[PDB]
Amino acid sequence: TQSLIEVKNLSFNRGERVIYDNISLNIRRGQITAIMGPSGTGKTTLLRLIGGQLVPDQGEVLLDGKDIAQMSRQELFAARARMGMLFQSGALFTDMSVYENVAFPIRAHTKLSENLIAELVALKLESVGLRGTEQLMPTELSGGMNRRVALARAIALDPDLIMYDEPFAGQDPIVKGVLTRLIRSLREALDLTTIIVSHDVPETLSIADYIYVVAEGKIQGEGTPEELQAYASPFVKQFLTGSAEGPVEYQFSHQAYLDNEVR
Amino acid sequence: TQSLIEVKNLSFNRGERVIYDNISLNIRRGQITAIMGPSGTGKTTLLRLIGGQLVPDQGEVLLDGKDIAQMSRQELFAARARMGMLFQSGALFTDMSVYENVAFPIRAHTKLSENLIAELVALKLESVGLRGTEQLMPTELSGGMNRRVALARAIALDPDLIMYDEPFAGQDPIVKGVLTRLIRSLREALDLTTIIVSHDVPETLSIADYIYVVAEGKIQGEGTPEELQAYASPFVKQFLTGSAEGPVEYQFSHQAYLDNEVR
Amino acid sequence: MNTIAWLGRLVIERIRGIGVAALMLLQIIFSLPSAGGFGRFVYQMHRVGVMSLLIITVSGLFIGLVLGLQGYSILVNVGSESMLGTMVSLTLLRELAPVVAALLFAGRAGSALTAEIGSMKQSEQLASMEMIGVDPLKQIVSPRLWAGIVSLPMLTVIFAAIGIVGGKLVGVDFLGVDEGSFWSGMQNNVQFGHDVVNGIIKSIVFALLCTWIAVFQGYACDPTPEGIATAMTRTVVYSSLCVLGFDFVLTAVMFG
Amino acid sequence: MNTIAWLGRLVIERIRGIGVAALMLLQIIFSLPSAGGFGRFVYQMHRVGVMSLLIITVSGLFIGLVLGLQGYSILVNVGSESMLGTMVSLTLLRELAPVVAALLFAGRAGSALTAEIGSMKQSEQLASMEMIGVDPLKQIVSPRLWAGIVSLPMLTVIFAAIGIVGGKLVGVDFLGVDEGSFWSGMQNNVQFGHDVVNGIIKSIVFALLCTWIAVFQGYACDPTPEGIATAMTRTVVYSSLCVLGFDFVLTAVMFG
Amino acid sequence: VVQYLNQELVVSGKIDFENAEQQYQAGLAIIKKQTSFPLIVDLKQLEHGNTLALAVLVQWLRQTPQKSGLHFKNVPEKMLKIIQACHLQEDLHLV
Ligand SMILES: Nc1ncnc2c1ncn2[C@@H]1O[C@H](COP(=O)(O)OP(=O)(O)OP(=O)(O)O)[C@@H](O)[C@H]1O
Ligand SMILES: Nc1ncnc2c1ncn2[C@@H]1O[C@H](COP(=O)(O)OP(=O)(O)OP(=O)(O)O)[C@@H](O)[C@H]1O
């Protein structure tokens, strides 16, 4: 319906790189808005542009009308209480305890009594299913359990804009099948708005509500996953199935071979 | 038919880790013999046990009858000319050129004239499709092109036992769809014997000839992918689909919650 | 003339590379104190200070013993070894405690500081902390700076004290002079406000350049962990050119 | 009494930790020479030697100037500064060229060697090389060892020469003594086979302990790149305890 | 002040961790004279739900005696999605 984020016509380019030359996105409420791309793009940089951690150069990032380079310093800190993100590999502080990881955004944000601050962590740690902790460290946590704490810090207070940088890292099909059901339920229960940047097509279309696709500076298609494959150029169609026919090079050069010699 | 490798009853355990307590495998010729497991197992260590780079402790690794801890030092170097492996992330030497990467196992093995040593590299670089190189370095190679050169290094001279440590790293569905067809063709053309350790079920059963599965010390099932799902215990069946029902914990504890308090 | 352009473009980058690092330093110290920073700071001084204490104590001896060996071998043919208590003290107070304790501090805590911040940029804890808005300059960097300014002058004092006591050990217990004479000449030549307090003013302005160059190369490094290890050996070069270069001037001054 | 057990099991590990490293050293030098190793070796000496040349030349001056500043300030009230050419030379020849050029070499090439091998274990080039059977001790380690034994005595000589020339610069060109009494007071007192050749025997057995402890902690480190950076600061501690400790045990032998 | 009398506790307004702790204090002081537990919990006049608004209720249960101290009704179903998400539907009681 109403848009959370209007991305409109940025050219945040890195010197040589042209990346995101002219693009425009719509992120509306309550809906899984997936994004697929080739590796070596600015996809996980794009989330920082939404987050305003990185700074745009020509466009506008409209968090409900207001641009996130125009607000003052005391509004910026208030604006980040609606949005919390996921760091690809999971970003845990390996010096504070796992009880101190998840309580940290509360104490960084607000003052409450200890019998409440210790109370919210024991609930959000149960909502991921890892509750018998709060005593051990981020060390001796298996990599499968690692992102789940980072998920709980992503739902610290109770934001309404969580961005996922590849939830399916290449883990077990167990933990892949775990986080499939974790994602929808929280979006159902807490009425959030998620974006998943992944390359994992049979999971991605089966769970998303809308898929934009960025290749290098352009939307090659959008909609629900039904009218992606209908209106597919044979550059984005081959991106879906991975065929060796299209404008991607499987052969590095084009030559008769029998022209130069071997030194 | 005849087995390349008889793995038989090893207990190569790491101090406290009783990994591979008692297991036994059969790798026969000409056939894709896939292996799936949970992350944090000894799967990529298991390949070193086949490779004899790591040393077993109680079992036997039978390369066509002969154990690979019984042969002498001049037979060991001759035995490794039938087998070449791929290291998960791709193992390129970032000081030698890409012409010097692939020619390196030839010069490390045999003396030939330069008009032949420079000739075999220009063919094996075309068989992966990256032939207009031999001039640039392993740097400025995109990560998608990185494993290819590795593929060449593998099928360097001409071995008949190549082990794959996760060919589908979590790359694009392009490069995933590229290496799907690269794997069979070389096994068809050069009559090899491949093993793929992956977690990528809809690609894995659709391309393998046999799937053993190691969880912690035991085969939970084997056969072709048709009689994996027939004779599936509800520990390996849930490993295939990733359901939250089975002997895997989604909840970390069972405490009746309402017991202790919050400090 | 192209390798000329490569050399030219490299040292042009190193100048700008400094002008960023000065701006990061003025952004740290000109800030309000964070709430409960003292509990962060004392734990930090437990990491940088107390860990390095052993390697400078037992290195305090071996500088002292060789000074107590060549200081004896020189002074015996001239006979006037009423200067043994003075030619152990005045070198150890004026130069080798500012100099050598810096090159050992740039070694351990000078280079372990640029790794710990080099690891925090790569796993993006520092990026994740910014989205929560805790601005990691005041959270991670600033206790890791003030535990380096305070903890180095607390080390050269411990270096110079165990150095002088070490010179007395192989001097009068294994070779033999008049302990009395020793102490006498020692306290009858070494002023306090001219020598010791000038031996600490040099050890403060060494602690600033050895930590601010160290904490910068961890922050403004790159990811790809060949990007950590190229930076942990970028401080230890850049410290030791600026320890000894800044020593000379200072010494000459406070010693016309 | 449990932290007692933690300390007890730690130094039990450090002893075993040595007994592995001696076995790796005897496995390198007692081997047949690899084919075409010289072309590998000369490129390696490019990496360790020639790169470190700048940071020891300009650090050769600042040790020389402070020796040419305190060496003047001491010798003026005693008046007998016919020893300025001798008290610049005999310290720089006997101690500070073996000692200080080691702590600067453990800094740059002592610690950049344990990173380059620390990076090669983690990406498993060293594991991949073994399956081809090229046994990476003779391929990667052994040219990275022999470019450290040869290249350090080629540096202390360049350190001691630019140090003495540096003492002559601020001595007689900015303060002023007899330019005749400098060298004629020098050349007579400083034997060659007793002082310079003993100033190199110390700089060989420093080059062995500073490289073999360095190339070991890269090989027997772990992956997980907090496992590189804990090892690149495990050499620079373990070198400087063994540079200075082995110095004092040596100078009592040749200058008893 | 938005937690009223009549042996029942009615929660109105919004719970947003600045006006959530004196809600916990003022709810606690009413509890200290509401012994023998005939009391019913009302929460019908909430307009927003989060785990924060849930968290103060269990602390009220934690201060009281035995497991079935408070009894719950007028749960506005934004809670009810959360309660099974932390899996509590028998751990606290209802109709
Ligand atoms: N600070 C920076 N800002 C912008 N670009 C950068 C920066 N640092 C490096 N780059 C370059 O830009 C690219 C950043 O893209 P990045 O890998 O972050 O996105 P991505 O490919 O979507 O990541 P992911 O692996 O999460 O999909 C890299 O190729 C890098 O070469
Ligand atoms: N040299 C070693 N030999 C045996 N075990 C080791 C060694 N070093 C570490 N380990 C431990 O054993 C495990 C090694 O398993 P490893 O991760 O290599 O296999 P894997 O989980 O199959 O890897 P992959 O990510 O390729 O699937 C690690 O958990 C580690 O804790």
PDB file of C-alpha atoms and ligand atoms in Angstrom, chain A residues 170-172, chain B residues 12-15 17 19-20 37-49 53-54 88-89 165-166 197-199 214, chain D residues 121 124 222-224, ligand 2:
ATOM      1  CA  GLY A 170      24.774 -22.360   2.248  1.00  0.00           C
ATOM      2  CA  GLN A 171      24.049 -24.104   5.522  1.00  0.00           C
ATOM      3  CA  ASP A 172      22.394 -27.490   6.083  1.00  0.00           C
TER       4      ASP A 172
ATOM      5  CA  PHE B  12      40.203 -41.004  12.820  1.00  0.00           C
ATOM      6  CA  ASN B  13      39.061 -39.017  15.816  1.00  0.00           C
ATOM      7  CA  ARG B  14      40.358 -35.607  16.878  1.00  0.00           C
ATOM      8  CA  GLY B  15      41.329 -35.799  20.543  1.00  0.00           C
ATOM      9  CA  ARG B  17      36.025 -35.432  18.586  1.00  0.00           C
ATOM     10  CA  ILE B  19      34.411 -38.135  14.197  1.00  0.00           C
ATOM     11  CA  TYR B  20      34.001 -41.140  11.870  1.00  0.00           C
ATOM     12  CA  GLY B  37      26.031 -34.149   5.649  1.00  0.00           C
ATOM     13  CA  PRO B  38      25.559 -31.549   8.387  1.00  0.00           C
ATOM     14  CA  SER B  39      28.001 -28.648   8.621  1.00  0.00           C
ATOM     15  CA  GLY B  40      30.642 -29.285  11.228  1.00  0.00           C
ATOM     16  CA  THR B  41      31.286 -32.890  10.230  1.00  0.00           C
ATOM     17  CA  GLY B  42      34.457 -34.376   8.785  1.00  0.00           C
ATOM     18  CA  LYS B  43      33.264 -34.391   5.173  1.00  0.00           C
ATOM     19  CA  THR B  44      36.018 -32.234   3.760  1.00  0.00           C
ATOM     20  CA  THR B  45      38.353 -34.027   6.112  1.00  0.00           C
ATOM     21  CA  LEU B  46      37.082 -37.357   4.751  1.00  0.00           C
ATOM     22  CA  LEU B  47      38.384 -36.425   1.326  1.00  0.00           C
ATOM     23  CA  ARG B  48      41.855 -35.931   2.757  1.00  0.00           C
ATOM     24  CA  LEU B  49      41.612 -39.411   4.230  1.00  0.00           C
ATOM     25  CA  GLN B  53      47.012 -36.098   2.961  1.00  0.00           C
ATOM     26  CA  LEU B  54      45.560 -36.620   6.394  1.00  0.00           C
ATOM     27  CA  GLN B  88      36.250 -25.576  -1.424  1.00  0.00           C
ATOM     28  CA  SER B  89      37.176 -21.949  -2.010  1.00  0.00           C
ATOM     29  CA  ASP B 165      34.371 -29.995  -2.008  1.00  0.00           C
ATOM     30  CA  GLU B 166      31.170 -28.078  -2.688  1.00  0.00           C
ATOM     31  CA  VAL B 197      29.873 -33.037  -0.938  1.00  0.00           C
ATOM     32  CA  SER B 198      27.020 -30.518  -1.021  1.00  0.00           C
ATOM     33  CA  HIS B 199      23.850 -29.423   0.769  1.00  0.00           C
ATOM     34  CA  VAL B 214      27.116 -39.254   6.943  1.00  0.00           C
TER      35      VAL B 214
ATOM     36  CA  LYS D 121      47.660 -22.392   5.233  1.00  0.00           C
ATOM     37  CA  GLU D 124      44.751 -24.402   1.599  1.00  0.00           C
ATOM     38  CA  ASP D 222      45.496 -22.231  12.716  1.00  0.00           C
ATOM     39  CA  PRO D 223      42.914 -21.017  10.192  1.00  0.00           C
ATOM     40  CA  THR D 224      40.026 -18.601  11.111  1.00  0.00           C
TER      41      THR D 224
HETATM   42  N1  LIG F   2      43.643 -30.474  11.500  1.00  0.00           N
HETATM   43  C1  LIG F   2      42.437 -30.913  11.919  1.00  0.00           C
HETATM   44  N2  LIG F   2      42.113 -32.225  11.880  1.00  0.00           N
HETATM   45  C2  LIG F   2      40.910 -32.664  12.283  1.00  0.00           C
HETATM   46  N3  LIG F   2      39.962 -31.849  12.768  1.00  0.00           N
HETATM   47  C3  LIG F   2      40.159 -30.513  12.862  1.00  0.00           C
HETATM   48  C4  LIG F   2      41.440 -29.956  12.429  1.00  0.00           C
HETATM   49  N4  LIG F   2      41.379 -28.630  12.617  1.00  0.00           N
HETATM   50  C5  LIG F   2      40.153 -28.358  13.126  1.00  0.00           C
HETATM   51  N5  LIG F   2      39.424 -29.478  13.267  1.00  0.00           N
HETATM   52  C6  LIG F   2      38.044 -29.572  13.800  1.00  0.00           C
HETATM   53  O1  LIG F   2      37.343 -30.543  13.035  1.00  0.00           O
HETATM   54  C7  LIG F   2      36.383 -29.920  12.200  1.00  0.00           C
HETATM   55  C8  LIG F   2      36.843 -30.062  10.763  1.00  0.00           C
HETATM   56  O2  LIG F   2      35.704 -30.284   9.954  1.00  0.00           O
HETATM   57  P1  LIG F   2      35.633 -29.471   8.586  1.00  0.00           P
HETATM   58  O3  LIG F   2      34.897 -28.174   8.795  1.00  0.00           O
HETATM   59  O4  LIG F   2      37.039 -29.472   8.055  1.00  0.00           O
HETATM   60  O5  LIG F   2      34.723 -30.412   7.679  1.00  0.00           O
HETATM   61  P2  LIG F   2      33.319 -29.923   7.090  1.00  0.00           P
HETATM   62  O6  LIG F   2      32.419 -29.418   8.185  1.00  0.00           O
HETATM   63  O7  LIG F   2      32.875 -31.076   6.243  1.00  0.00           O
HETATM   64  O8  LIG F   2      33.810 -28.714   6.167  1.00  0.00           O
HETATM   65  P3  LIG F   2      32.940 -28.084   4.980  1.00  0.00           P
HETATM   66  O9  LIG F   2      32.679 -26.681   5.453  1.00  0.00           O
HETATM   67  O10 LIG F   2      33.882 -28.188   3.808  1.00  0.00           O
HETATM   68  O11 LIG F   2      31.689 -28.922   4.887  1.00  0.00           O
HETATM   69  C9  LIG F   2      36.215 -28.489  12.661  1.00  0.00           C
HETATM   70  O12 LIG F   2      34.993 -28.390  13.393  1.00  0.00           O
HETATM   71  C10 LIG F   2      37.341 -28.241  13.625  1.00  0.00           C
HETATM   72  O13 LIG F   2      36.763 -27.840  14.863  1.00  0.00           O
END
